[PDB]
Amino acid sequence: EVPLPQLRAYTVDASWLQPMAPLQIADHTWQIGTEDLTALLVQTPDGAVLLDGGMPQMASHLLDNMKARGVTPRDLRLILLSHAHADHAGPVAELKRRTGAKVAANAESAVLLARGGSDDLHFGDGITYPPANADRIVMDGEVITVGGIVFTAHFMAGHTPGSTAWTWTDTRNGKPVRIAYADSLSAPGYQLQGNPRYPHLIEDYRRSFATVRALPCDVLLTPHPGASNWDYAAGARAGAKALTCKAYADAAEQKFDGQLAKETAG
Amino acid sequence: EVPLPQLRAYTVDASWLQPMAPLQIADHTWQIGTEDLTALLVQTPDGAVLLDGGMPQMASHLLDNMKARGVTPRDLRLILLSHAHADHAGPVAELKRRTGAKVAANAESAVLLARGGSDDLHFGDGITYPPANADRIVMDGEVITVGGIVFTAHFMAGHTPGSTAWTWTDTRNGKPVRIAYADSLSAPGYQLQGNPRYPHLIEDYRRSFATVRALPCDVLLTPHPGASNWDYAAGARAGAKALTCKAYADAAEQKFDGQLAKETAG
Numbered sequence: 001e002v003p004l005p006q007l008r009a010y011t012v013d014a015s016w017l018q019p020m021a022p023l024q025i026a027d028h029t030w031q032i033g034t035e036d037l038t039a040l041l042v043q044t045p046d047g048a049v050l051l052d053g054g055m056p057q058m059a060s061h062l063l064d065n066m067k068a069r070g071v072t073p074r075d076l077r078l079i080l081l082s083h084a085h086a087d088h089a090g091p092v093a094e095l096k097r098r099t100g101a102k103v104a105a106n107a108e109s110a111v112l113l114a115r116g117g118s119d120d121l122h123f124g125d126g127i128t129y130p131p132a133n134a135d136r137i138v139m140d141g142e143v144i145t146v147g148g149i150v151f152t153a154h155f156m157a158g159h160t161p162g163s164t165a166w167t168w169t170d171t172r173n174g175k176p177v178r179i180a181y182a183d184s185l186s187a188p189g190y191q192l193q194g195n196p197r198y199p200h201l202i203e204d205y206r207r208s209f210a211t212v213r214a215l216p217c218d219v220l221l222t223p224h225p226g227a228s229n230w231d232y233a234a235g236a237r238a239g240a241k242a243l244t245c246k247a248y249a250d251a252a253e254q255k256f257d258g259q260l261a262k263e264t265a266g
Numbered sequence: 267e268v269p270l271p272q273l274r275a276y277t278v279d280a281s282w283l284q285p286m287a288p289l290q291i292a293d294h295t296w297q298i299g300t301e302d303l304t305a306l307l308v309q310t311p312d313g314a315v316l317l318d319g320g321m322p323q324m325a326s327h328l329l330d331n332m333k334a335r336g337v338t339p340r341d342l343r344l345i346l347l348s349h350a351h352a353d354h355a356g357p358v359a360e361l362k363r364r365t366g367a368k369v370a371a372n373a374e375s376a377v378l379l380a381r382g383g384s385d386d387l388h389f390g391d392g393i394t395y396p397p398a399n400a401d402r403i404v405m406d407g408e409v410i411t412v413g414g415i416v417f418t419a420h421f422m423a424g425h426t427p428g429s430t431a432w433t434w435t436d437t438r439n440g441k442p443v444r445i446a447y448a449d450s451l452s453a454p455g456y457q458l459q460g461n462p463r464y465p466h467l468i469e470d471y472r473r474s475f476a477t478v479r480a481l482p483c484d485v486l487l488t489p490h491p492g493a494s495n496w497d498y499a500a501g502a503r504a505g506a507k508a509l510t511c512k513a514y515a516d517a518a519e520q521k522f523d524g525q526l527a528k529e530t531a532g
């Protein structure tokens with residue numbers, strides 16, 4: 001007698017779960033997540049924005065870092081997402097319960113967020129998290145303005161259908177810094193060709209490489225910092241080795257072409 | 267450096283996950299779940315009803331047992347629930363994707379089901395499962411009829427706000443058998459007194475004991491069979507030692523009174 005298997009929790013590298021203090025990126029923009037997951041806090045005179053929250057169990061750490069920055073729960077106005085996987089949108093439901101924040105996302109991300117990442121096109125129910133509702137649906141190229149910082153959505157479907165880059169202009173040393181928070185361009189274990197759940201997967205990825213290459217991009221940040229060669233633990237040198245958006249897109253495309261060739265061979 | 271803890275999966279006793287073949291309860295009614303979780307299949311000339319599905323990973327086993335019974339995915343018309351915890355509603359989302367089934371539930375169970383059991387009044391996010399939407403909302407005492415079997419909802423709030431007993435009349439040996447599928451009356455680790463998330467918890471449980479005592483009840487079944495002294499592995503004697511609804515309610519109330527006294531002492 002063999003019982004059905006136990007449910008398996010979504011476990012990750014310890015660095016993904018390693019708390020860090022807030023690391024300033026530009027005058028209004030801070031990394032407040034963990035060593036290996038991005039969660040960006042943007043502070044304005046008219047409230048704060050969070051872009052991604054990381055894993056589900058990061059909610060309280062995020063709230064601590066906001067507090068350290070001067071941002072109370074009522075000051076958090078808006079949550080934006082790169083994509084609605086558990087390691088980026090994980091604590092969103094809880095953050096909505098514990099703060100004033102409302103979520104803006106595109107339709108694809110909203111429907112995946114609302115089912116807590118279940119029935120994923122590639123992962124099935126293997127990587128789920130508490131579901132949350134979007135409060136605003138955004139379209140490609142739409143802007144959201146908070147405390148006068150202007151965030152623009154750039155859709156870059158592929159990693160998930162709803163993958164989005166967010167761009168905004170901050171400052172440092174009195175000069176503008178065009179920040180591009182580009183989503184993942186990876187396809188981990190995905191069936192790329194002839195996938196019945198995502199028939200135009202390859203065309204979407206190619207289009208997304210071109211989108212990312214062309215972003216306004218003085219500084220690139222990514223949901224997994226290593227993807228853009230950030231090292232959040234490296235202090236004053238954390239961003240020193242960061243890729244350009246062009247280099248990030250080129251590397252992702254070369255990796256993707258390799259994966260396609262391997263899929264054909266396997 | 268101490269990272270945040272990994273997520274912990276909801277793991278259960280192996281007997282809860284031990285597949286069994288269909289066990290007939292009455293002419294139209296079969297247990298098709300596992301040794302220690304109830305999932306009742308009711309077959310009519312106008313489609314089938316499932317009452318509970320057990321754990322999330324039981325979906326395929328349920329579908330196998332339906333097939334063994336003559337019930338194809340398109341023949342499954344209706345899913346009813348005792349309560350929307352992971353060990354009873356776990357596979358509902360997947361069953362909806364893979365069958366014709368629609369879900370009927372009361373409002374409390376629908377909202378908990380739709381958030382996949384997250385933000386539970388007592389468990390928090392400790393016991394979550396894939397979310398699903400209800401297709402029909404039922405009121406207390408409302409009837410649903412399928413292929414001419416009449417199911418009546420009897421609300422028995424306490425274990426969850428949306429806890430429901432379902433009753434119907436089947437036959438055996440040409441005589442009616444009034445079957446009562448009563449929900450859990452347990453309060454595992456619950457704060458009973460002065461609970462800010464459930465202020466009238468104790469009054470609801472007392473009312474629910476009285477509801478259960480009074481059900482039409484030739485045969486009692488419960489979501490955890492041991493609660494009503496069923497032994498699904500005992501073959502022709504599986505139901506021999508089953509409690510009456512009266513005895514089940516009395517035992518739950520005595521246990522509940524003990525728990526209250528212990529809570530006061532602790």
Ligand SMILES: O=C(O)[C@@H]1CS[C@H]2CS[C@H](CS)N21
Binds near residue numbers: 085087186188
């Ligand atoms: O390769 C990836 O993109 C990462 C690293 S591990 C893999 C599965 S979980 C996470 C979803 S973004 N993913």
Ligand SMILES: O=C(O)[C@@H]1CS[C@H]2CS[C@H](CS)N21
Binds near residue numbers: 353450452453454
């Ligand atoms: O005591 C109970 O009612 C059972 C047994 S174990 C405990 C927590 S999980 C499940 C929810 S019904 N519950």
Ligand SMILES: [Zn+2]
Binds near residue numbers: 085159
């Ligand atoms: Zn992802």
Ligand SMILES: [Zn+2]
Binds near residue numbers: 085087088184223
């Ligand atoms: Zn990720």
Ligand SMILES: [Zn+2]
Binds near residue numbers: 349351425450
């Ligand atoms: Zn329960």
Ligand SMILES: [Zn+2]
Binds near residue numbers: 351353354450489490
């Ligand atoms: Zn249970």
